[PDB]
DNA sequence: CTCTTTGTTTCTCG
DNA sequence: GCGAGAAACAAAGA
């Protein structure tokens, strides 16, 4: 998932598990806990969930006063709230059990990660990752964004995917954003003019905020605790190879850019 | 049978 | 430093 989908999951967990005492924690795949599973089990059993935050595509569980569990879902990670008697599913890896149910993490590809760190280590953790600003008008400063684009010869799509110019875009929303802002994904960033940078800046904020309002995009695998998003119905290019651009009627094309499948209108997004 | 594709991140190689 | 390619892993389609 990308930022919109992670935020939707964050909001649903906030509503449902805040205030819950963790009775026990179990793993069938303890190796995805990067800080040590038996260590996490010992520290968190008997603690109460106080909050759930997010930074970029990362979930942050706030547990007791001084623990933060940082969870990344990578490509296929999924959480569900289940009854205590729910049967195991094939790709279930970890569970936190409460009095009235359990929070299960599943990940077919085993890419997702958990890391237990202290409250005062959360800010340093994300500085070390080099995560850029959240995609909001208040945090995403167009002036610094412009200056960074000016000095680079990186192609715009790969650069945006790095999470360093702005946090939260992945393959779906980077494609949607570039189509909205009429920029070709292979455009070298130092070639972008000020007015194009301004439309790109605003289009990143607008599309992600729309995706969040609509509960994310459900394409193949995504749902927020069993709830389908509605953003998939608004996609203009991603997965739309061979269909006609809603603006000009040209056929959406798909190419490969830096290892990634890339969907664009060849008329609206001039090379 | 092989080869390609997939909502992420982070490594090696030259 | 960089870009290209690939690994971590599983499943599905051609
Ligand atoms: Zn078009």
Resolution in angstroms, to 1 decimal, for this deposition? Answer: 2.0
Name the structure determination technique: X-ray
* Structure tokens given for A171: 């393959």
**CB of A78 within 7 Å of some strand B atom:** no
DSSP string, chain A: --HHHHHHHHHHHHHHHTT-B--EEEES-GGGBTT-HHHHHHHHTT-BEEEEEEETTEEEEEETTTEEEEEE-TTT-EEEEE-TTPPP-TTEEEEEE-SS-EEEEE-TTS--EEEEEEGGGHHHHHHHHT----SSTTT--HHHHHHHHHT--SBHHHHHHTSSSSS---HHHHHHHHHHTT--TT-BGGG--HHHHHHHHHHHHHHHHHHHHTT---SSS--BTTB--SGGGG-SSTT-TTSBPTTT-PBPEEEEETTEEEEE-TTTS--
| Residue nearest C3, CA–C1′ metric | A258
State, as a whole number of angstroms, the distance between the CA of A270 and the C1' of B10: 32
Domain boundaries in chain A? 1-132, 133-271
Backbone angles phi, psi at A259, to 5 degrees: 85, -5
Q: Which of A10, A41, A54, A57 is catalytic?
A: A57
Q: What is the whole-number distance in angstroms between the Cα of residue A148 and the centre of ligand 1?
A: 28
Whole-number Å distance between alpha carbons of A160 and A176: 12
State, as a whole number of angstroms, the distance between the CA of A179 and the C1' of B14: 35
Q: Is A72 part of any known ligand binding site?
A: no
Order of all β-strands in the sheet with A24-27: A24-27, A92-97, A102-106, A78-82
Q: What region, left, alpha or beta, does residue A64 occupy, with left being phi > 0 and alpha being psi -120 to 50 degrees?
A: left
- Domain A1-132 sits in CATH 3.60.150.10: no
**CB of A77 within 7 Å of some strand B atom:** no
| Residue nearest C2, CA–C1′ metric | A154
State, as a whole number of angstroms, the distance between the CA of A220 and the C1' of B6: 10
Q: What is the whole-number distance in angstroms between the Cα of residue A253 and the centre of ligand 1?
A: 10
Of all nucleotides, the one whose C1′ comes closest to residue A158's CA is: C3
Architecture of domain A133-271 in CATH? Orthogonal Bundle (1.10)
State, as a whole number of angstroms, the distance between the CA of A206 and the C1' of C5: 34
């Amino acid at each position: 998932p990308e930022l919109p989908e992670v935020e939707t999951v964050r909001r649903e967990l906030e509503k449902r598990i805040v205030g819950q005492k963790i009775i026990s924690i179990e793993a069938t795949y303890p190796r995805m806990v990067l800080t040590g599973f038996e260590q996490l089990k010992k520290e968190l059993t008997g603690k109460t969930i106080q909050g759930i935050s997010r930074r970029g595509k990362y979930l942050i569980f706030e547990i007791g006063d001084d623990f933060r569990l940082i969870s990344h879902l990578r490509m296929e990670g999924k959480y569900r709230l289940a009854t205590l008697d729910a049967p195991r599913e094939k790709h279930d890896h970890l569970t936190m059990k409460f009095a009235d149910g359990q929070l299960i993490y599943a990940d077919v590809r085993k890419f997702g990660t958990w890391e237990l760190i202290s409250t005062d280590q959360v800010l340093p953790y994300f500085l070390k990752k080099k995560i850029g600003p959240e995609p909001t008008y208040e945090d995403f400063d167009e002036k610094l964004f412009r200056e960074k684009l000016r000095k680079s010869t990186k192609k715009i799509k790969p650069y945006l995917l790095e999470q360093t110019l702005v946090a939260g875009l992945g393959n779906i929303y980077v494609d949607e954003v570039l189509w909205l802002a009429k920029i070709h994904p292979e455009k070298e960033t130092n070639q972008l003019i000020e007015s194009s940078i301004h439309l790109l800046h605003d289009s990143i904020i607008e599309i992600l905020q729309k995706a969040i309002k609509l509960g994310g995009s459900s394409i193949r695998t995504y749902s927020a605790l069993g709830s389908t998003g509605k953003m998939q119905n608004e996609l203009q290019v991603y997965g739309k190879t061979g269909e006609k651009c809603s603006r000009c009627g040209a056929e959406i094309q798909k190419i490969k850019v830096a290892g990634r499948g890339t969907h664009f209108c060849p008329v609206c997004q001039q090379k």
